[PDB]
Design a protein around this motif. Structure first.
Motif, PDB file in Angstrom:
ATOM      1  N   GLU A 253      21.121  34.960 169.145  1.00 31.69           N
ATOM      2  CA  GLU A 253      20.685  36.235 168.586  1.00 31.69           C
ATOM      3  C   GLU A 253      19.585  36.038 167.551  1.00 31.69           C
TER       4      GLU A 253
ATOM      5  N   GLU B 106      16.296  34.958 169.323  1.00 33.92           N
ATOM      6  CA  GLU B 106      15.632  35.995 170.107  1.00 33.92           C
ATOM      7  C   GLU B 106      14.783  36.909 169.231  1.00 33.92           C
TER       8      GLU B 106
ATOM      9  N   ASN C 154      22.160  46.209 170.918  1.00 32.73           N
ATOM     10  CA  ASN C 154      22.105  45.225 169.841  1.00 32.73           C
ATOM     11  C   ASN C 154      23.109  45.534 168.736  1.00 32.73           C
TER      12      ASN C 154
ATOM     13  N   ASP D 248      26.470  43.977 169.498  1.00 29.43           N
ATOM     14  CA  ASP D 248      26.513  42.555 169.174  1.00 29.43           C
ATOM     15  C   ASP D 248      26.588  42.337 167.669  1.00 29.43           C
TER      16      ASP D 248
END
Ligand SMILES: O=c1c2c3nc(n2Cc2ccc(Cl)cc2)Oc2ccc(F)c(c2)OCCCCCCn3c(=O)n1CCCO
Ligand SMILES: O=c1c2c3nc(n2Cc2ccc(Cl)cc2)Oc2ccc(F)c(c2)OCCCCCCn3c(=O)n1CCCO
Ligand SMILES: [Ca+2]
Ligand SMILES: [Zn+2]
Ligand SMILES: [Zn+2]
Lengths: 600, 88, 49, 153, 51
Positions: free
Chosen positions: A292, A295, A310, A313
């Protein structure tokens, strides 16, 4: 003579060089473009002409603010005329240098203008559609494969699809959902599997299960040597997808063992050491966090915050991170053993088990983002996405209808609030065996009215002590009036509105799924070498030649498109009254001249 | 500079003023003037009978869409170029 | 023989159905104009000279 | 026959929405599992007169969530002994969130999809019945001499 | 048309033959990788002619 499309009269009038139906601003080159003739436009551009330029939005020069307050109904008419002139296919195809990239940048800022000008919304909206079919037709007028390869790989100012990425950042859903574009890609998403013409339910079903188990050895082989013959076999758009999908079911299956204990110790210590099953879960979490955070680096932060998966997460990672500290604090502070029936309501070991239970739900409901890769479950998520834009307004009305009634009942029963010790079994509130004290405070009157929608609330909660009889009737009436408004008048409207809402999204339900799966596929094409989560922690002449090659294809495509569009008109048009009169006049003049000659 | 100029970017060839009256007479039915232009172009050489109008139509594809079977037999008795004219 | 007869009847009926249920268009108007034009030209040629 | 090709996909979604929730509740209440002898009338589980032990194991948590769709499950099964109060609130919230997703958002879609599915099979409903009855009739035309079952031996 | 077809069959003509499905000859696998947008157009034309 330009509104009635004749060609001899125009030339004749050009050669011989207080009431009207036209406003005082129309010019010839502007009026010949509202109509869509190709031969008349070409005669006026060979002489020198010009079209004005409109200012940008929200401009604040002295002219734009002075003229907009002396005449405000004439200043809002010229812009529409100019924008209707500029957006015609023939003018775009006759005098532009790149006819494909000029319909992208002009069909995107005719939609923004549809929001600040509430009067001409429909007009601007419909002008924004003539710029999306032009490019699609100009593309599907192709006759070979070398032409597609030349077109889709043009970069102005290497050999990746440098023009199929610009059509995705403009939301062109008809340019990337075409047979040829969807057939050039399938010959790259299935590289290494020369034939997919196999038995549908057995062999192609078994080969993937066979490939699934090999992900650890494939990963370590790529890790130790990336240029062998066993390496370089993972850098294929299909194998990476298979490995990443397989690395998740193991994690989701190594959690059911922690829910129901296979073998453990008894539960009386404040804080025990972590067991074997827990020792092996931290690598997955660390890998997810590292992925994460990585990215977010090679990508736009604005682009990141624009995806709605998102936040899920983020919440999952936060709830997973709190548990470690909450479990080490109790291991370092406390010591010893004591029975479970004497702990406190706010003990660290008790608050560190609710979050771990809640997190599994938000971690198991994420297998619905895989339905876009299948043909049967695909078009169902896109139709479900529309149903969730209907409950919001009825929810808005329902929240007010509930906040209204949540006060009257609370104001009436707040005099007879008893205690807990004076009640059987020392239970106070709803959720006991014999329900009591349901309308005392404002926090309970909000849960009772909710639970009374499904039917789990009894009727003997409105009977008050102290023998007073006039109050109970008003309470029963207030409770009975609230049910008719919620169970009989509102739920009979959600159905009748969702039924209508469903019968308008059934059409164009295949153009919006292929866009999604294409955007999915385009994410693995690049060489990133993304290992699974556990193992994730260890000059002139060229430009000249290209610009020279790119023009001939455009010329041929334009020729073919123009000819076909001219031909389509002569076959699908009806007759009218204007035609009859010309024939009558022809016969009349013939008669007159023949009689003149013969008689005299 | 608040004006937008206009011009042609992909140019092509054009027709003279002597090769236009021919194609204009073909589109109206005049049979005695086309027969004279077909004969004057065999002693002197000023017109080529295989010209192409703005839209790619020649002198034999204008006589097929207007169904005229008396100018086709005149244009075929002189040597013209028959290409893909059986598919039209 | 049955096949031959059936084919004849079917072909004839399908040809007949077309002439009755079809509309007009712009291609037709031009041919009529050209007919009148050529008639005029030849008659004037004969009479005037 | 056409209505039974509509429930499959919604059943697919429902089975996942049920397997998701069947774990969280089981993970939270598996510390207070009593015995049978220490309970009135020696009855353990749902289907007694006074229901108890409804979220102990994984096999009971699957029957309780099913029976709670029709309305035959009471609300006093989420009250736990041992005086702990923070757990009961999380349990009640998890139980109340599952009802809105199943009784208000899904059953309002089956109706709206079956209504549309019915208005497309109404046409050509006589060309598919005569084919069936013709295929039926063509089975007895042949000489088989099939006696009734009892005399068939 | 019925009258135009009858004029072209009285002179000798011919229509090609399409291969069976899943054929694996060298031509069907060689041509299908040199030009793949032209090989998928001829079969549709032939099948529209035959029907
Ligand atoms: O029992 C009712 C009731 C009722 N509306 C009724 N009834 C039945 C009834 C009818 C007549 C009599 Cl003399 C007594 C009770 O019936 C009607 C009769 C005509 C209507 F037009 C109507 C409802 O619908 C109006 C909107 C609903 C209001 C519910 C109030 N409403 C109500 O709050 N209670 C609760 C009172 C608890 O004791
Ligand atoms: O009681 C509720 C509840 C609720 N959503 C509610 N309520 C009523 C309520 C409102 C305010 C307060 Cl301060 C306390 C309770 O109301 C709303 C209010 C606004 C909404 F937008 C909404 C529901 O719908 C959102 C989706 C449904 C989630 C149910 C969770 N949900 C819930 O699990 N319980 C169970 C708790 C057991 O004690
Ligand atoms: Ca992410
Ligand atoms: Zn302005
Ligand atoms: Zn083949």
């Amino acid at each position: 003579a330009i509104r009635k499309e004749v060609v001899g009269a125009v030339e004749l009038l050009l050669s011989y060089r207080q009431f009207s139906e036209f406003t005082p601003d129309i010019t010839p080159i502007m009026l010949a473009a509202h109509t869509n003739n190709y031969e008349i436009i070409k005669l006026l551009v060979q002489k020198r002409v010009t079209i004005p330029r409109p200012h940008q939005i929200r401009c604040n020069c002295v002219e734009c603010v002075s003229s907009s307050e002396v005449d405000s109904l004439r200043h809002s008419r010229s812009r529409l005329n100019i924008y209707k002139a500029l957006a015609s296919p023939s003018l775009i195809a006759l005098s532009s240098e790149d006819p494909i990239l000029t319909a992208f940048r002009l069909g995107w800022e005719l939609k923004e203008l549809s929001k600040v000008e509430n009067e001409f919304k429909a007009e601007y909206e419909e002008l924004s559609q003539q710029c999306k079919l032009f490019a699609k037709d100009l593309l599907d007028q192709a006759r070979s494969s070398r032409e597609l390869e030349i077109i889709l790989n043009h970069r102005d100012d290497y050999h990746d699809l440098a023009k199929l990425k610009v059509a995705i950042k403009y939301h062109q859903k008809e340019f990337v959902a075409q047979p040829n574009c969807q057939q050039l890609l399938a010959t790259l998403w299935y590289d290494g599997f020369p034939g997919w013409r196999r038995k549908h339910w057995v062999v192609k079903l078994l080969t993937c299960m066979t490939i699934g188990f090999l992900f650890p050895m494939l990963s370590i082989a790529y890790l130790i040597s990336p240029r062998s013959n066993l390496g370089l076999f993972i850098k294929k758009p299909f194998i990476k997808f298979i490995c990443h999908t397989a690395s998740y079911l193991t994690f989701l299956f190594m959690l059911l063992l922690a829910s129901q204990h296979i073998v453990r110790t008894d539960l009386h210590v404040q804080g025990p050491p972590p067991t074997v099953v827990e020792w092996m879960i931290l690598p997955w979490v660390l890998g997810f966090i590292w992925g994460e955070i990585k990215e977010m680096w090679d990508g736009g932060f604005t682009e990141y915050i624009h995806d709605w998966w998102n936040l899920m997460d983020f919440a999952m990672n936060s709830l997973y991170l709190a548990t470690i500290s909450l479990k080490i604090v109790a291991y370092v502070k406390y010591n010893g053993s004591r029975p479970r029936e004497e702990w406190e309501m706010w003990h660290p070991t008790l608050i560190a088990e609710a979050l771990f239970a809640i997190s599994n739900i938000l971690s198991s409901l994420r297998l619905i983002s895989l339905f876009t890769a299948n043909s049967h479950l695909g078009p169902l998520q896109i139709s479900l996405g529309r149903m969730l834009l209907d409950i919001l307004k009825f929810l808005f009305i329902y929240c007010l209808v509930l906040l209204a009634f949540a006060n009257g009942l609370n104001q009436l029963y707040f005099y007879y609030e008893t205690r807990a010790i004076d009640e059987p079994n020392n239970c106070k509130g709803i959720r006991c065996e014999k329900q009591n004290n349901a309308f005392s405070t404002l926090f309970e009157t909000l849960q009772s009215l909710f639970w009374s929608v499904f039917g789990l609330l009894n009727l003997y909660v409105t009977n008050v002590k102290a023998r007073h009889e006039f109050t109970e009737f008003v309470g029963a009436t207030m409770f009975g009036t609230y049910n008719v408004i919620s169970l009989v008048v509102l739920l009979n409207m959600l159905i009748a509105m969702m039924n209508n809402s469903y019968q308008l999204i059934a059409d164009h339900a295949d153009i919006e799924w292929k866009f999604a799966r294409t955007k999915l596929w385009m994410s693995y094409f690049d060489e990133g070498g993304t290992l699974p989560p556990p193992f994730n922690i260890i000059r002139h002449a060229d430009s000249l030649i290209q610009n020279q090659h790119y023009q001939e294809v455009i010329r041929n495509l334009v020729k073919r498109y123009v000819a076909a569009m001219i031909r389509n008109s002569k076959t699908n048009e009806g007759l009218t009254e204007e035609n009859f009169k010309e024939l009558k006049q022809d016969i009349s003049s013939f008669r007159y001249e023949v009689l003149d000659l013969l008689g005299n | 500079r608040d004006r937008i100029p206009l011009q042609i970017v992909r140019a092509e060839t054009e027709l003279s003023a002597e090769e236009k009256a021919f194609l204009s007479a073909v589109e109206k039915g005049d049979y005695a003037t086309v027969k004279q232009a077909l004969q004057e172009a065999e002693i002197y050489y000023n017109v080529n009978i295989n010209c192409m109008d703005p839209l790619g139509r020649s002198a034999l594809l204008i006589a097929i869409e207007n169904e005229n079977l008396e100018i086709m037999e005149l244009l075929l008795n002189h040597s013209v170029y028959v290409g893909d004219a059986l598919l039209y």
